Symmetry: D2
Subunit: 324 residues, 4 copies
């Protein structure tokens, strides 16, 4: 299938490159590093070879979310975005950009998102989970009141926010002590991102801003499988849920979320996602260069869904979402 | 469908009762309290009305896992087991017991499991996640080396170990700060239990003791949906996984684990579990009294699976697993 | 779920009433007969109680298709259609009509479809499989060349054609001799209708008129389950299929067909249809009065699909299809 | 996955070879002919290359079912069965046999099945739909009363009966006239076989012999998708079904039938069958030489099911069904 749109497709700048070093064995780092820095050449050949018309590009991880000085975070985000705009402009029919944002300061993040969308033609934002900030004794999650004016801005711009993983901070990760193999994509990323996403939903953010669109990778970080249980556990109790939001969590999941297939090339899981959220809210993605383009495309080509849905997931849904 | 076997079915003693307080709103505590304390009477009428032949009973939560003096944990486990055995004996065709165990101390736990299996006729153990023990600065997880001789006894006895949830300790729960709605069955129970189970799998425990049987409630706490990703993430990398176990995580999930339907009455979730672990390793359970028997039974009666698999999940699998036809 | 649209919903006129007698046991005939005749009263109360906003009504079976004199068939069709228009006009927000057509004569059927659509505001046609005609020694199936100008007319009007069952003729039903329990909805209706549809697909009709929309009840009469096998059996043989159509049978199935849930209230069956043709092509229907509205609605309310797709199958798909 | 058991795997003798002609284009006949006649050599190499330990072999189609003189049918069945026994004995760890049977004559069919099971060590029978017999004005279907003593014998022997397709007779095939492309595996085989199987269930045969085991290829010829509808259509009517059987059709489908994956290598269809009849009653098979071994094995290797069910469908179910891990098959 030609014409696919892929939207969790990463690069690094020299400035952020080393953030990705921890995530593969030392012998595989030169390969991963070269993939991260390459945008124009091998990446596009592989797109050609595997039926991808367009990659929506985003910076690597944790990148800006780990830059604890908010002034420095803004400066880095702005440099990464200008670079990305220049890269996109070289092959404008094959690429779009997601913004890197300095979420350390809601106001700076809002301004940078406006610049990115209206000046640079970017089609959304991608943010690696909570932010570290020297002014805050705690990690910053985006359900917090200070972020409401930022979300108002997102909704006004009508572009999606892709909530990407990062690892929990060490003091929030003791369950994984002595078990580092569970950190990262194996498991810890999924738990961190699912809970951050649930925090947004429980906060009532989508009551106030009901047109917001949040994207999750990895087929939604386990959420569809346990979604029924999230609202319906202990159903014999008749009570008002103890979160600020007005409706059930699944209503927000159904109305405000999109899932991508990145790094989760499993037909059973896709079928479960289809039967919980619908093929209209599922988008093809690879997670290149952390996952191979060939693996992602070959799996997707042959997965056990209708051809009508393969088209929607392949490109139709993304076409509509990003007004492409 | 009559003849069902259910095996995540809880009671409290007056001693452990307060552990369940504040899992429900105040207005509902009189009802939960009465359910937890009733074994002989209304519980059996509900079983009769909803086609459950046998409930395998277990103490509530965290119960023994929160008794930080190991000597007292053992004393409590022993009293609760003796009580359970007495209650089982009043209606022996309708009940079996799971052991409560003082996991604070591996030798005490192994000895108590032996007594429960050999002297009391118990058919497995149920433990509410990690243990607190005054002697340990850190919570105790059962992948730790000190537990290996205990697991040797589990395998020798050839009875399953049900790994039930508890909440993370507050200092390991900062992600939920300001969001207490996420603690308990909503989410936190699932994460804590999935990770504890994965820690057992990655530790190599099942290489050393391959015949062990571990049971998880709640359709495996999310595990089936993300199981492919656990082993296969970043597949382009050819490397040996950085855990001590010798095989893939999914090999031990497939070979050593069973899932029950407790508190997760969702047909899509069941189908996904069937397509990942197979109907032979899925067991009906309810999580009474925290979930209604009528809700669990009515959902299961009509869920979209073959009748052959309805019989296996309803009773066939448990009959084989627990040797009840034997 | 309020606002459902249901589109295999039957009535009889006194003229066609007895065609339905003997589909149910004698003790049940008085009930069925009263249901068939009632359009305005109990039927609407039941729609209210079971969340159906609109029923697209069609005549019973075999009706016009068993009237062998083509002139008589056209007279009966006109009366039934005029009656239906008068009935729809009494409660115009709750009903629409499908045309009955004298398929015995392709020109008369085209003209009657035109009159029904243009003058009566009907939104499609419903036909009970093959037609009997005195002038023809064989039953008339609609893939035959004489039907092509009719199909040109259907396409130009841009309204769907609902291919409903009837039983095979006795000389074409010997396999059921001594086994009358297999006739009708049990099995024979499904075989008869699947093959009629497949004849349409293989004939090349949809090469010539690619915008045609055909609707099948009963979740597609077994088609999705065996659809892969229809094209891909004996795949090691590299050859051109021996039918006149230019593409695979499944291409026409995917592009030209819709399925309804009528009389097949089975979640496993619906999931298989979703994974083969996609939820965009599946439509809620009951087969009232042959099946109960309460059974149909209760099953569909709780079936194991996404809320997005429940809305699409419930009403969204029909709204789009019929331009309501 | 090595170790698979496949049980819809065909051969021809020179006697029955021409029955398979005109199933494929002329250009492909030399290949199909060579596959049908080869049992010992390339067939085993392809089994080795695609992870099949055992093929349970059966004659091609319609073969015995089209021999209308019952005396001649019995003669052909005997010769075909002796040939198969001799062939199996050459490589007894890789092959088992299904009986070809002269179903024209209930008595002859029962005696030949006895001979095949007791003397030749065959593990079931495979019959290609209805029989033509000169004495009968109508095609012979196995729900008919005269077959009940034959089925008593099947149950007593406790071996399965694989009901394979054949086309309807032309006079029963007018719906396909001018549409020959629908004949055969495309569609007509499936309709024919589904109905024949339904006639057995409706007849009450399984009330009388409840231990019978019937096998269907092609994932059960459409039956699972439409099984709910078979019993439950028009449910508001409270009535006794108008067939002689005492129970619901689905009760017999669930209790007396097995389905194989032959010629239906479709994951959506497998999942549907799993959720209707259960993986315990599904068996890997290929339909070699009419389907490729490699296509069947490659699809099954990667289909979206549990590893536990992949072992059951791949070999476990068949190993148990045909008692292949048992003394009479291993040592005698
Ligand atoms: Cl009829």
């Amino acid at each position: 299938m030609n014409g696919k749109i892929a939207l969790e497709e990463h690069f690094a700048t020299e400035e952020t490159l080393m953030d990705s070093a921890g995530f593969v064995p030392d012998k595989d780092w030169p390969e991963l590093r070269s993939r991260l820095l390459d945008i124009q050449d091998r990446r596009v050949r592989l797109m050609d070879e595997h039926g991808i018309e367009t990659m929506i590009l985003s910076l690597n991880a944790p990148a800006v979310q780990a830059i604890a000085d908010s002034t420095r975070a803004n400066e880095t985000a702005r440099r990464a975005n200008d670079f990305l705009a220049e890269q996109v402009a070289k092959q404008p029919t094959r690429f779009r950009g997601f913004a890197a944002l300095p979420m350390q300061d809601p106001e700076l993040a809002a301004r940078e998102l406006e610049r990115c969308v209206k000046e640079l033609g970017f089609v959304g934002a991608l943010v690696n989970g909570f932010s570290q900030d020297n002014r805050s004794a705690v990690p910053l999650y985006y359900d917090m009141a200070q972020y409401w004016p930022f979300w108002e801005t997102v909704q006004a711009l009508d572009v999606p926010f892709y909530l990407h993983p990062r690892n929990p901070l060490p003091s929030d990760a003791r369950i994984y002590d002595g078990h580092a193999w569970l950190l990262g994509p194996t498991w810890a990323f999924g738990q961190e991102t699912a809970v951050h996403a649930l925090r947004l939903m429980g906060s009532g953010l989508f009551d106030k801003y009901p047109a917001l669109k949040i994207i999750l990778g990895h087929m939604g970080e386990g959420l569809p499988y346990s979604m029924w249980r999230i609202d319906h556990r202990n159903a014999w109790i008749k009570t008002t849920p103890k979160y600020p939001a007005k409706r059930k969590i699944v209503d927000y999941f159904n109305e405000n979320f999109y899932l991508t297939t990145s790094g989760n090339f499993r037909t059973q899981t896709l079928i479960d996602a289809i039967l919980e959220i619908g093929a209209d809210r599922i988008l093809f993605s690879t997670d290149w260069p952390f996952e191979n383009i060939d693996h992602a495309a070959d799996w997707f080509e042959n997965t056990s869904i209708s051809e009508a849905d393969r088209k929607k997931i392949g490109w139709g849904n993304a076409q509509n979402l990003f007004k492409l």
